Coordinates of N, CA and C and ligand atoms in Angstrom, one line a residue:
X1 N 0.8 -1.2 0.0 CA 0.0 0.0 0.0 C 0.9 1.3 0.0
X2 N 2.0 1.3 -0.7 CA 2.6 2.6 -1.2 C 1.6 3.2 -2.1
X3 N 1.4 4.5 -2.1 CA 0.5 5.2 -3.0 C 1.0 5.1 -4.5
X4 N 2.3 5.2 -4.7 CA 2.9 5.0 -6.0 C 2.5 3.7 -6.6
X5 N 2.8 2.6 -5.8 CA 2.5 1.3 -6.2 C 1.0 1.0 -6.4
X6 N 0.1 1.4 -5.4 CA -1.3 1.2 -5.6 C -1.8 1.9 -6.9
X7 N -1.3 3.0 -7.2 CA -1.8 3.7 -8.4 C -1.4 3.1 -9.7
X8 N -0.2 2.5 -9.8 CA 0.3 1.7 -11.0 C -0.5 0.4 -11.0
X9 N -0.6 -0.3 -9.9 CA -1.4 -1.5 -9.8 C -2.8 -1.3 -10.4
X10 N -3.5 -0.2 -10.0 CA -4.8 0.1 -10.4 C -4.8 0.3 -12.0
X11 N -3.8 0.9 -12.6 CA -3.8 1.2 -14.0 C -3.6 -0.1 -14.7
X12 N -2.6 -0.8 -14.3 CA -2.3 -2.2 -14.9 C -3.5 -3.0 -14.8
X13 N -4.2 -3.0 -13.7 CA -5.4 -3.8 -13.6 C -6.4 -3.3 -14.6
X14 N -6.5 -2.0 -14.8 CA -7.5 -1.4 -15.7 C -7.2 -1.6 -17.2
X15 N -5.9 -1.5 -17.5 CA -5.6 -1.4 -18.9 C -6.0 -2.6 -19.8
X16 N -6.5 -2.3 -20.9 CA -6.9 -3.2 -21.9 C -6.0 -3.3 -23.1
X17 N -5.4 -2.2 -23.4 CA -4.6 -2.0 -24.7 C -3.1 -2.1 -24.5
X18 N -2.4 -2.7 -25.4 CA -1.0 -2.6 -25.5 C -0.6 -1.1 -25.7
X19 N -1.4 -0.3 -26.5 CA -1.0 1.1 -26.7 C -1.1 1.9 -25.4
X20 N -2.2 1.8 -24.7 CA -2.3 2.5 -23.4 C -1.3 2.0 -22.5
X21 N -1.0 0.7 -22.4 CA -0.1 0.1 -21.6 C 1.4 0.7 -21.8
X22 N 1.7 1.0 -23.0 CA 3.0 1.7 -23.2 C 3.2 2.8 -22.3
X23 N 2.2 3.7 -22.1 CA 2.3 4.9 -21.3 C 2.6 4.5 -19.8
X24 N 1.8 3.4 -19.2 CA 2.1 3.0 -17.9 C 3.6 2.6 -17.8
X25 N 4.0 1.8 -18.8 CA 5.5 1.3 -18.7 C 6.5 2.5 -18.6
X26 N 6.2 3.5 -19.5 CA 7.1 4.7 -19.4 C 7.0 5.4 -18.1
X27 N 5.8 5.5 -17.5 CA 5.7 6.1 -16.2 C 6.3 5.3 -15.1
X28 N 6.3 4.0 -15.2 CA 7.0 3.2 -14.2 C 8.6 3.4 -14.4
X29 N 9.1 3.5 -15.6 CA 10.5 3.7 -15.8 C 10.8 5.1 -15.3
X30 N 10.0 6.1 -15.5 CA 10.2 7.4 -14.9 C 10.2 7.4 -13.4
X31 N 9.2 6.8 -12.8 CA 9.2 6.7 -11.3 C 10.4 6.0 -10.8
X32 N 10.8 5.0 -11.4 CA 12.0 4.3 -11.0 C 13.2 5.2 -11.1
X33 N 13.4 5.9 -12.3 CA 14.5 6.9 -12.4 C 14.4 7.9 -11.2
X34 N 13.2 8.4 -10.9 CA 13.1 9.4 -9.9 C 13.4 8.9 -8.5
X35 N 13.0 7.7 -8.2 CA 13.3 7.1 -6.8 C 14.8 6.9 -6.7
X36 N 15.5 6.6 -7.7 CA 16.9 6.5 -7.6 C 17.6 7.9 -7.3
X37 N 17.1 8.9 -8.1 CA 17.6 10.2 -7.9 C 17.3 10.7 -6.4
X38 N 16.1 10.6 -6.0 CA 15.7 11.0 -4.7 C 16.6 10.3 -3.6
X39 N 16.8 8.9 -3.7 CA 17.6 8.2 -2.8 C 19.1 8.7 -2.9
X40 N 19.6 8.8 -4.1 CA 21.0 9.2 -4.3 C 21.3 10.5 -3.7
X41 N 20.3 11.5 -3.8 CA 20.6 12.8 -3.3 C 20.5 12.9 -1.8
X42 N 19.7 12.1 -1.2 CA 19.7 12.0 0.3 C 21.0 11.4 0.8
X43 N 21.5 10.3 0.1 CA 22.7 9.7 0.6 C 23.8 10.7 0.5
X44 N 23.9 11.5 -0.6 CA 25.0 12.5 -0.7 C 24.8 13.8 -0.1
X45 N 23.7 14.0 0.6 CA 23.4 15.3 1.3 C 23.4 16.4 0.2
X46 N 22.9 16.2 -1.0 CA 22.8 17.2 -2.1 C 21.3 17.3 -2.3
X47 N 20.9 18.5 -2.8 CA 19.5 18.9 -2.9 C 18.9 18.2 -4.1
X48 N 17.7 17.5 -3.8 CA 17.0 16.8 -4.8 C 16.2 17.8 -5.7
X49 N 16.5 17.7 -7.0 CA 15.6 18.3 -7.9 C 15.3 17.3 -9.0
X50 N 14.3 17.5 -9.8 CA 14.1 16.8 -11.0 C 13.7 17.7 -12.1
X51 N 14.5 17.8 -13.1 CA 14.2 18.7 -14.3 C 14.2 20.1 -14.0
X52 N 15.3 20.8 -14.0 CA 15.5 22.2 -13.8 C 15.9 22.8 -15.1
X53 N 15.3 23.9 -15.5 CA 15.6 24.6 -16.8 C 17.0 25.1 -16.7
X54 N 17.8 24.9 -17.8 CA 19.1 25.4 -17.9 C 19.2 26.9 -17.5
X55 N 18.2 27.6 -18.0 CA 18.1 29.1 -17.7 C 18.0 29.3 -16.1
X56 N 17.3 28.4 -15.5 CA 17.2 28.6 -14.0 C 18.6 28.2 -13.3
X57 N 19.3 27.2 -13.9 CA 20.6 26.9 -13.4 C 21.6 28.1 -13.6
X58 N 21.6 28.7 -14.7 CA 22.5 29.8 -15.0 C 22.2 31.0 -14.0
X59 N 20.9 31.2 -13.7 CA 20.5 32.4 -12.9 C 20.9 32.1 -11.4
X60 N 20.9 30.8 -11.0 CA 21.2 30.5 -9.7 C 22.8 30.6 -9.4
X61 N 23.6 30.2 -10.4 CA 25.0 30.2 -10.2 C 25.6 31.6 -10.5
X62 N 24.9 32.4 -11.4 CA 25.4 33.7 -11.8 C 24.2 34.6 -12.1
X63 N 23.6 35.1 -11.0 CA 22.3 35.9 -11.2 C 22.5 37.2 -11.9
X64 N 23.8 37.7 -12.0 CA 24.1 38.9 -12.7 C 24.3 38.8 -14.2
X65 N 24.4 37.5 -14.7 CA 24.6 37.3 -16.0 C 23.7 38.1 -16.9
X66 N 24.1 38.6 -18.1 CA 23.3 39.3 -19.0 C 22.6 38.3 -19.8
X67 N 21.6 37.7 -19.3 CA 21.0 36.4 -19.9 C 20.5 36.8 -21.3
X68 N 20.1 38.0 -21.6 CA 19.5 38.3 -22.9 C 20.4 38.1 -24.1
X69 N 21.7 38.2 -23.9 CA 22.6 38.1 -25.1 C 23.2 36.6 -25.2
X70 N 22.5 35.6 -24.7 CA 22.9 34.2 -25.0 C 21.7 33.4 -25.5
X71 N 22.0 32.5 -26.4 CA 21.0 31.5 -26.8 C 21.1 30.3 -25.9
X72 N 20.2 30.3 -24.9 CA 20.2 29.2 -23.9 C 19.2 28.2 -24.4
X73 N 19.6 27.0 -24.8 CA 18.7 25.9 -25.2 C 17.8 25.6 -23.9
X74 N 16.6 25.3 -24.2 CA 15.6 25.0 -23.1 C 15.6 23.5 -22.7
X75 N 16.8 23.0 -22.3 CA 16.9 21.6 -21.8 C 16.8 21.6 -20.3
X76 N 16.2 20.4 -19.8 CA 16.1 20.2 -18.3 C 16.9 19.0 -17.9
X77 N 18.1 19.2 -17.4 CA 18.9 18.1 -16.8 C 18.3 17.7 -15.5
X78 N 18.7 16.5 -15.0 CA 18.1 16.0 -13.8 C 18.4 16.8 -12.6
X79 N 19.6 17.3 -12.4 CA 20.0 18.1 -11.3 C 21.3 18.8 -11.6
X80 N 21.9 19.5 -10.6 CA 23.1 20.1 -10.7 C 23.8 20.4 -9.3
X81 N 25.1 20.4 -9.3 CA 25.8 20.9 -8.1 C 26.7 22.1 -8.5
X82 N 26.6 23.1 -7.9 CA 27.4 24.4 -8.0 C 28.3 24.4 -6.8
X83 N 29.7 24.3 -7.0 CA 30.6 24.3 -5.8 C 31.1 25.7 -5.5
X84 N 30.8 26.7 -6.3 CA 31.4 28.0 -6.3 C 32.6 28.2 -7.2
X85 N 33.0 27.1 -7.8 CA 34.1 27.1 -8.8 C 33.8 26.2 -10.1
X86 N 32.9 25.2 -9.9 CA 32.6 24.3 -11.0 C 31.1 23.9 -11.0
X87 N 30.5 23.9 -12.2 CA 29.1 23.4 -12.3 C 29.0 22.0 -12.7
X88 N 28.5 21.1 -11.8 CA 28.3 19.7 -12.2 C 26.9 19.5 -12.7
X89 N 26.7 19.1 -13.9 CA 25.4 18.8 -14.5 C 25.1 17.3 -14.2
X90 N 24.1 17.0 -13.5 CA 23.8 15.6 -13.1 C 22.6 15.0 -13.9
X91 N 22.8 13.8 -14.4 CA 21.7 13.0 -14.9 C 21.7 11.7 -14.2
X92 N 20.5 11.2 -13.7 CA 20.4 9.8 -13.2 C 19.9 8.9 -14.2
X93 N 20.3 7.6 -14.0 CA 19.9 6.5 -14.9 C 19.8 5.3 -14.2
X94 N 18.8 4.5 -14.6 CA 18.6 3.1 -14.0 C 18.5 2.2 -15.2
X95 N 19.5 1.4 -15.3 CA 19.6 0.6 -16.5 C 20.6 -0.6 -16.3
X96 N 20.5 -1.7 -17.1 CA 21.5 -2.6 -17.1 C 22.5 -2.3 -18.3
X97 N 22.2 -1.6 -19.2 CA 23.1 -1.2 -20.3 C 23.6 0.2 -20.3
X98 N 24.6 0.5 -21.1 CA 25.2 1.8 -21.2 C 24.5 2.7 -22.1
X99 N 23.7 2.2 -23.1 CA 23.3 3.0 -24.3 C 22.5 4.2 -23.8
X100 N 21.6 4.1 -22.9 CA 20.9 5.3 -22.4 C 21.8 6.3 -21.8
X101 N 22.9 5.8 -21.1 CA 23.8 6.7 -20.6 C 24.6 7.5 -21.7
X102 N 25.1 6.8 -22.7 CA 25.9 7.5 -23.7 C 25.0 8.4 -24.6
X103 N 23.7 8.0 -24.7 CA 22.8 8.9 -25.4 C 22.6 10.2 -24.7
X104 N 22.3 10.1 -23.4 CA 22.1 11.3 -22.6 C 23.4 12.1 -22.5
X105 N 24.5 11.4 -22.2 CA 25.8 12.1 -22.1 C 26.1 12.9 -23.3
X106 N 25.8 12.5 -24.5 CA 26.1 13.2 -25.6 C 25.1 14.4 -25.8
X107 N 23.9 14.1 -25.5 CA 22.8 15.2 -25.5 C 23.1 16.3 -24.6
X108 N 23.5 16.1 -23.4 CA 23.9 17.1 -22.4 C 25.2 17.8 -22.9
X109 N 26.1 17.1 -23.4 CA 27.3 17.8 -23.9 C 27.0 18.7 -25.0
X110 N 26.3 18.3 -26.0 CA 25.9 19.1 -27.2 C 25.1 20.4 -26.7
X111 N 24.2 20.3 -25.7 CA 23.3 21.3 -25.5 C 23.6 22.2 -24.3
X112 N 24.4 21.9 -23.4 CA 24.7 22.6 -22.2 C 26.1 23.3 -22.3
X113 N 27.1 22.5 -22.6 CA 28.5 23.0 -22.4 C 28.7 24.3 -23.3
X114 N 28.2 24.4 -24.5 CA 28.7 25.7 -25.3 C 28.2 26.9 -24.7
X115 N 26.9 27.0 -24.4 CA 26.4 28.3 -23.8 C 27.1 28.5 -22.4
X116 N 27.4 27.4 -21.7 CA 28.2 27.6 -20.5 C 29.5 28.2 -20.7
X117 N 30.2 27.7 -21.8 CA 31.5 28.2 -22.1 C 31.4 29.7 -22.5
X118 N 30.5 30.1 -23.2 CA 30.3 31.5 -23.5 C 30.1 32.3 -22.3
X119 N 29.4 31.8 -21.3 CA 29.2 32.6 -20.1 C 30.4 32.6 -19.2
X120 N 31.3 31.6 -19.3 CA 32.5 31.5 -18.5 C 32.3 30.7 -17.2
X121 N 31.4 29.8 -17.2 CA 31.2 28.9 -16.0 C 31.7 27.5 -16.3
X122 N 32.7 27.1 -15.6 CA 33.3 25.8 -15.7 C 32.2 24.7 -15.5
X123 N 31.9 23.9 -16.5 CA 30.8 23.0 -16.4 C 31.2 21.6 -16.9
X124 N 30.8 20.6 -16.2 CA 31.1 19.2 -16.5 C 29.8 18.4 -16.4
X125 N 29.7 17.4 -17.4 CA 28.5 16.6 -17.5 C 28.8 15.3 -16.7
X126 N 27.9 15.0 -15.8 CA 28.1 13.8 -14.9 C 26.8 12.9 -15.0
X127 N 27.0 11.6 -15.2 CA 25.9 10.7 -15.2 C 26.1 9.6 -14.1
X128 N 25.2 9.3 -13.3 CA 25.2 8.3 -12.3 C 24.2 7.2 -12.6
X129 N 24.6 6.0 -12.7 CA 23.7 5.0 -13.2 C 23.6 3.8 -12.2
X130 N 22.4 3.4 -11.9 CA 22.2 2.3 -11.0 C 21.7 1.1 -11.9
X131 N 22.4 0.0 -11.7 CA 21.9 -1.3 -12.2 C 20.7 -1.8 -11.3
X132 N 19.5 -1.8 -11.8 CA 18.4 -2.2 -10.9 C 18.5 -3.7 -10.4
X133 N 19.3 -4.6 -11.1 CA 19.4 -5.9 -10.6 C 20.4 -6.1 -9.5
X134 N 21.6 -5.7 -9.8 CA 22.8 -5.8 -8.9 C 22.9 -4.7 -7.9
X135 N 22.2 -3.6 -8.1 CA 22.4 -2.3 -7.4 C 23.8 -1.7 -7.5
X136 N 24.6 -2.0 -8.6 CA 25.9 -1.4 -8.8 C 25.7 0.0 -9.3
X137 N 26.6 0.9 -8.9 CA 26.5 2.3 -9.3 C 27.7 2.6 -10.1
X138 N 27.4 3.0 -11.4 CA 28.5 3.5 -12.4 C 28.4 5.0 -12.4
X139 N 29.5 5.7 -12.3 CA 29.7 7.1 -12.3 C 30.5 7.5 -13.6
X140 N 30.1 8.6 -14.3 CA 30.8 9.3 -15.2 C 30.9 10.8 -14.8
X141 N 32.1 11.4 -15.0 CA 32.4 12.7 -14.5 C 33.5 12.7 -13.4
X142 N 34.7 13.1 -13.8 CA 35.9 12.9 -13.0 C 35.7 13.7 -11.7
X143 N 35.1 14.9 -11.7 CA 35.0 15.7 -10.5 C 34.0 15.2 -9.6
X144 N 32.9 14.7 -10.1 CA 31.8 14.0 -9.2 C 32.5 12.9 -8.4
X145 N 33.2 12.0 -9.1 CA 33.9 10.9 -8.4 C 34.9 11.4 -7.3
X146 N 35.5 12.6 -7.6 CA 36.4 13.2 -6.5 C 35.6 13.7 -5.4
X147 N 34.4 14.3 -5.6 CA 33.6 14.9 -4.5 C 32.9 13.8 -3.7
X148 N 32.5 12.7 -4.4 CA 31.8 11.6 -3.7 C 32.3 10.3 -4.1
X149 N 33.5 10.0 -3.4 CA 34.2 8.7 -3.7 C 33.4 7.5 -3.0
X150 N 32.6 7.8 -2.1 CA 31.7 6.8 -1.5 C 30.3 7.2 -1.5
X151 N 29.4 6.3 -2.0 CA 28.0 6.6 -2.2 C 27.2 5.6 -1.3
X152 N 26.7 5.9 -0.2 CA 26.1 5.0 0.7 C 24.6 5.0 0.5
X153 N 24.2 4.7 -0.7 CA 22.8 4.4 -1.0 C 22.4 3.1 -0.7
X154 N 21.2 2.8 -0.1 CA 20.6 1.4 0.0 C 19.4 1.5 -1.0
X155 N 19.3 0.7 -2.0 CA 18.2 0.8 -3.0 C 17.5 -0.6 -3.0
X156 N 16.3 -0.5 -3.6 CA 15.5 -1.7 -3.7 C 14.4 -1.4 -4.8
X157 N 14.7 -2.0 -6.0 CA 13.9 -1.7 -7.1 C 12.8 -2.8 -7.3
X158 N 12.6 -3.7 -6.3 CA 11.7 -4.8 -6.5 C 10.3 -4.4 -6.9
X159 N 9.7 -3.4 -6.2 CA 8.4 -2.9 -6.5 C 8.3 -2.6 -7.9
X160 N 9.3 -1.9 -8.5 CA 9.3 -1.5 -9.9 C 9.3 -2.7 -10.8
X161 N 10.3 -3.6 -10.5 CA 10.3 -4.9 -11.2 C 8.9 -5.6 -11.2
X162 N 8.3 -5.8 -10.0 CA 7.0 -6.5 -10.0 C 5.9 -5.8 -10.8
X163 N 5.9 -4.5 -10.8 CA 4.9 -3.7 -11.6 C 5.1 -4.1 -13.1
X164 N 6.4 -3.9 -13.6 CA 6.7 -4.1 -15.0 C 6.4 -5.5 -15.4
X165 N 6.8 -6.5 -14.5 CA 6.5 -7.9 -14.8 C 5.0 -8.1 -15.0
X166 N 4.2 -7.4 -14.2 CA 2.8 -7.7 -14.3 C 2.3 -7.2 -15.6
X167 N 2.7 -6.1 -16.1 CA 2.4 -5.5 -17.4 C 2.8 -6.6 -18.5
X168 N 4.0 -7.0 -18.4 CA 4.5 -7.9 -19.5 C 3.8 -9.2 -19.4
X169 N 3.3 -9.6 -18.3 CA 2.5 -10.9 -18.3 C 1.0 -10.6 -18.8
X170 N 0.6 -9.4 -18.6 CA -0.8 -9.1 -19.2 C -0.8 -9.1 -20.7
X171 N 0.4 -8.8 -21.4 CA 0.4 -8.6 -22.8 C 1.6 -9.4 -23.4
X172 N 1.6 -10.8 -23.1 CA 2.6 -11.7 -23.6 C 2.7 -11.6 -25.1
Ligands
LIG201 CL1 16.4 6.0 -16.3
LIG202 MN1 15.3 13.1 -16.8

């Protein structure tokens, strides 16, 4: 009787269509991504956000920026850390493979770093990935690994697994 679980259960119970069920599956994958981020930020004593506009990040680190003379792409990374000298752009991932990591890594690089270079904010793209089966944590970003060499998260993706399995069983 978690509310998140009960609400997915109810939709899986209700769904008749493979088409509508695709949306439930994506929402489960999203909720799983967000649970990892929430837990990861608690373990690291860093502020949890999910999807902050790049414009909002620039204004927090440098409120005096003359924002009007930059083309700021309207991307929403998962989170960020501003140390006072470097900006760490964070994305969370829950996956067994690398591909989603490499896709996002390149997306964030193409879209964030150039305007940040124009502004003069030292920025680095970091991705943290949880394997939902083994609970192994893979990190990309040299400075993140320096700031957080130990990550004491305790994770449990079983509820997410059970929900997805029930969908897959409904639509063999
Ligand atoms: Cl994910
Ligand atoms: Mn995201």
